[PDB]
Design an enzyme around this catalytic site. Structure first.
Site, PDB file in Angstrom:
ATOM      1  N   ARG A 167       0.890  -1.203   0.000  1.00 24.76           N
ATOM      2  CA  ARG A 167       0.000   0.000   0.000  1.00 24.76           C
ATOM      3  C   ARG A 167       0.889   1.202   0.000  1.00 24.76           C
ATOM      4  NH1 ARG A 167      -4.101  -1.198   4.983  1.00 24.76           N
ATOM      5  NH2 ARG A 167      -5.074   0.613   4.026  1.00 24.76           N
ATOM      6  N   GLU A 225      -5.037   6.864  -0.285  1.00 27.15           N
ATOM      7  CA  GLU A 225      -6.241   6.064  -0.360  1.00 27.15           C
ATOM      8  C   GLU A 225      -7.515   6.881  -0.095  1.00 27.15           C
ATOM      9  OE1 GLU A 225      -5.555   2.770   2.283  1.00 27.15           O
ATOM     10  OE2 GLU A 225      -3.846   1.892   1.206  1.00 27.15           O
ATOM     11  N   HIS A 265     -10.886   7.123   1.643  1.00 25.42           N
ATOM     12  CA  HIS A 265     -11.554   6.495   2.824  1.00 25.42           C
ATOM     13  C   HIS A 265     -12.957   7.087   2.981  1.00 25.42           C
ATOM     14  CE1 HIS A 265     -12.387   6.114   7.239  1.00 25.42           C
ATOM     15  NE2 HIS A 265     -12.111   7.417   7.417  1.00 25.42           N
ATOM     16  N   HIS A 266     -13.908   6.275   3.461  1.00 29.43           N
ATOM     17  CA  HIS A 266     -15.222   6.870   3.701  1.00 29.43           C
ATOM     18  C   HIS A 266     -15.331   7.119   5.218  1.00 29.43           C
ATOM     19  CE1 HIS A 266     -15.964   5.206  -0.205  1.00 29.43           C
ATOM     20  NE2 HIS A 266     -16.979   6.114  -0.367  1.00 29.43           N
TER      21      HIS A 266
END
Ligand code: NI
EC number: 3.1.-.-
Lengths: 131, 83
Positions: free
Chosen positions: A96, A100, A102-103
């Site tokens: 990773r 990213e 993200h919610h």
């Protein structure tokens, strides 16, 4: 159903003003907001999946001077393809190595998939620590 | 092709670094995998910061990156490019 992320939807939400340190905030707290400028460009568009939305966000940042200035050339080439740009080594975890989406309120808990007010940019180190 | 940096000639390593810098790949995954490979080959402590978050005044151009790697390996007791 398989995944709510793969169901089409329209992007909504305002996002928030950001400045020169925008991606620096992705490494702190709940992450950095989707900029008000990106939201203005994607708002009302229909996406077939969240992955699609994510590629749109990164192409938009590539064309945005403020947001793009400082992303080095090699990150500019990546976001110009719609890829997520690489984070600094210290925020990467394992395989990773990019920023990213993200919610803030999880989709599995009813948070909206394409509501840009529920979406945060995070580094893999902060995404896992914000969990 | 790619087991360790000593399997690379300096030209070929410059090819790999040029591809990464231009993101000349078919998916994000392939790019990620190349950058990972690069790190594994160089063994440099900065990892992918050599390509994406270079130091103040460091030439982050492809040739710039290869020189930096080349000079670090040399200075750190490690094997260099093939030939
Ligand atoms: Ni999340």
């Amino acid at each position: 159903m398989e995944s709510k992320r793969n169901k089409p939807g329209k992007a909504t939400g305002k996002g928030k003003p950001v400045g020169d340190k925008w991606l620096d905030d992705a490494g702190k707290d709940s992450g950095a907001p989707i900029p008000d400028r990106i939201a203005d460009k994607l708002r009302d568009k229909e996406f077939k999946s969240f992955d699609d939305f994510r590629k749109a966000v990164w192409e938009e940042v590539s064309k945005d001077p403020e947001l793009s200035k400082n992303l080095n050339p090699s990150n500019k080439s990546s976001v110009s393809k719609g890829y997520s740009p690489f984070t600094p080594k210290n925020q990467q975890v394992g395989g990773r190595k990019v920023y990213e989406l993200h919610h803030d309120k999880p989709i599995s808990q009813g948070g909206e998939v394409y509501d840009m007010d529920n979406i945060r940019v995070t580094t893999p180190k902060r995404h896992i620590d914000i969990h | 092709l790619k087991a360790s940096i000593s399997d690379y000639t300096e030209a070929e390593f410059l090819q790999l670094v040029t591809t990464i810098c231009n993101a000349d790949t078919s998916s994000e995954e392939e790019l990620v995998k190349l950058v990972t490979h690069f790190e594994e080959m160089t063994e440099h402590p900065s990892g992918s910061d050599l390509i994406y978050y270079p130091k103040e005044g460091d030439d982050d151009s492809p040739s710039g990156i290869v020189n930096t790697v080349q000079q670090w390996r040399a200075a750190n007791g490690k094997s260099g490019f093939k030939q």
